[PDB]
Design a protein around this nucleic acid. Sequence first.
DNA 1: AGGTAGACTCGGACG
DNA 2: CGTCCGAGCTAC
Length: 253
Amino acid sequence: PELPEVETIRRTLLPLIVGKTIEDVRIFWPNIIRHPRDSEAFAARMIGQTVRGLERRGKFLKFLLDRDALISHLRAEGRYAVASALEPLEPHTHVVFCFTDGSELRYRDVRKFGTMHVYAKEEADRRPPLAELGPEPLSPAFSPAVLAERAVKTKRSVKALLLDCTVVAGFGNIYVDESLFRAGILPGRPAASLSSKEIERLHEEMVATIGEAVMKHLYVYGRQGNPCKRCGTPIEKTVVAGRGTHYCPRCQR
DNA sequence: AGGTAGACTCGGACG
DNA sequence: CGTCCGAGCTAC
Ligand SMILES: [Zn+2]
């Protein structure tokens, strides 16, 4: 899931778990657990804590308990569900939080690619994976000025810059390509090559693109070989910043 | 110094 | 049957 979907998960999951108390934590793929390094310590420490809140930073979910925060990243295919301990688990369920009311918060991930870290709440923001995370794209903290300052100081492409979690939080591949198309900027452009006008336009399209998605369709992403919706030129796909990258070679320069 | 590329994690889809 | 893919500690 991308940022807007993670926000939807945050909003919908919270009422399904708030106020529940963890009675057991079962782990079927210990590698998902990144901190504490020992999955048995991870399980032991959460037992007895009650869920108090659920926040989002970038694409990270931050479960707030009594003493600890659980920081979870789902990557592309991770998913949470709340269900009865009496019913068989869905396939690819790797971690289950069992509540005293007989319900469970289950984490599934066919790719086994997501991560979990638990720290005392007051430490979470200054430890991985939240440490050094950039500002929320929809916050005043993410400004043209902030974007301009990062862009001038790097030799990287503008696409690489936008994918950098320290620059802006959780702005995914799809939204990078869409925003660059909407701003009329080629993804392979050196970030430092962007004018003030272009940085302003890019910031504006980033906010509009992800903001529109958060409230509730694609110009380029996955549309290679099909006509641009604005000019009819075939959309092209190449590798930029180590990712599949889609663009219109007429609309973007 | 620290910015930056590479290694790493996985299994479904693809040739 | 190998190769590809991609979000977010190690080593030049
Ligand atoms: Zn076009």
